[model samples]
Target: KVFGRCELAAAMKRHGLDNYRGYSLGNWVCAAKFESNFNTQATNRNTDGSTDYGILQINSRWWCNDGRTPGSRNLCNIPCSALLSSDITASVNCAKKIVSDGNGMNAWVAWRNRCKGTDVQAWIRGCRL
Candidate 1:
């Protein structure tokens, strides 16, 4: 959901990408469609007390900290719309980079694995990412 909502859309607009307008929208939609269900609020914990949080499914350790304190996973309650303002483009670009640089479909393959067989385009649209 990080790139799905108003804030990121606004930011993309600022960057000159109209919603679903760019040629990249196909792949962008593919990213959000398949990753984290476009749900910025998503979270999951590991036994080591580590966590994955937010729409890009960012690892909590690196992202939640500002280097001032041992950050809490709770620090990452950012709405998907607000991700660009928060500089989530790093993760967004990372995800796409992985997909692009690797086996080309690896990222999407991984995402679909998580989705467990949902209607893909429908999922993409519903998430609005």
Candidate 2:
């Protein structure tokens, strides 16, 4: 795990995402858990042949450009590789912009299926933040 749950919360807060786009930090953390198990270098191939990158599992179809993928909007204007770093700043920024575009955390299907409408407080239960 790149972060213990509490550390993850603090990192999210440090990225200015404490309540980004009206979604709670818990949602972000919860999504991260289900998406990539907090692994910064995580990646997965979709059945559609697109790829998901980094902790939030951002999709290459609409977000980052890997050059290998054709017709990617690269809406975040970042290399898919950049989102795979342990640093995570780029991924966090891009995710904030993605949420601001009105997708909310629904950009992450894991969030919609698992974290939505539940008592997400457990996601940050022991976090100092």
Candidate 3:
């Protein structure tokens, strides 16, 4: 499921993303734009042999265990395949866990490259969140 901007915001809000940690909804919106372009099933293969899965692009290396990542940690205690669900709860929860676990949102280079130290409000400007 490819979510529209407002729809994603609404869903994230329902799942507890509002000002999550110190990051705002807009902050996540900005990061997700670059991470997966709001596509729930988005996946990417990393050069390090770990795969990134789903909307927030959670990594299998240290987060979810794909059972394919060497030395997998499975810190999120979820299957990497769970991140691909259209529901997006797993993706959002894993992102929260990433930040909660002291990694901050910078765990995703996409967020650092696009959202860190930026006015993320622009990403959700038209969306009524």
Candidate 4:
């Protein structure tokens, strides 16, 4: 009811991130499972405006520089769970164009390469995956 592996898998594949290019599916799955059962609509009232939502559990304010509200389509356009979301993907790339100048994933570049080797558990749990 909370999370669905199939849906997660689909999201990953859609974004070309299912190859485990350094991101452990297991760990990502576990983290998502724990956070909001992979619920894209998950949200909470935060005075500070830092909350995780959608499949990747992304904090709307953190990624959405344009600003986000409870029912804003701008927020919905970007699935918080996976960076693969149309808006997230575009935003990250846009940032790269400005700062890194299309260098790479930028802050998340490390994960892009090393996440495949790391176990899923390592990401979700304190121990190792």
Residues 1-129, candidate 4: write the lDDT tens digits. Answer: 233565554454454453343444454554455544555555543466555444444445545322454533333354444433433244223323222324322233323454434565443333221
**Model 3 per-residue lDDT tens digits across residues 3-59:** 999899889988999799988898888888898999889999999999999888989
TM-score per candidate, in order?
0.39, 0.95, 0.95, 0.45
Tens-digit per-residue lDDT, 49-105, candidate 2: 789999999988889998777766899999999999978799999998889877788
Q: What is the C-alpha RMSD of each candidate to the true structure, in Å?
A: 7.7, 1.1, 1.1, 8.4
The better candidate by lDDT, 2 or 4, is 2
- In model 2, what is the error at residue 115, expressed in angstroms? 0.2
Worst 10 residues of 2 by lDDT: 1-10
Model 1, span 15-121: residue lDDT tens:
43333322233344444545555565556554556555445454444345323224443234433234333455554543443344435434344445644244433
lDDT of 3: 0.87
lDDT of each: 0.43, 0.88, 0.87, 0.43
**Evaluation by lDDT, superior candidate among 1 and 3:** 3
Residue 90 of model 3, lDDT score: 85
- State the weakest 10-residue window (summed lDDT) of model 3: 120-129
- Looking at model 4, residue 16 earns an lDDT score of 47
Clashes of each: 1, 0, 0, 12
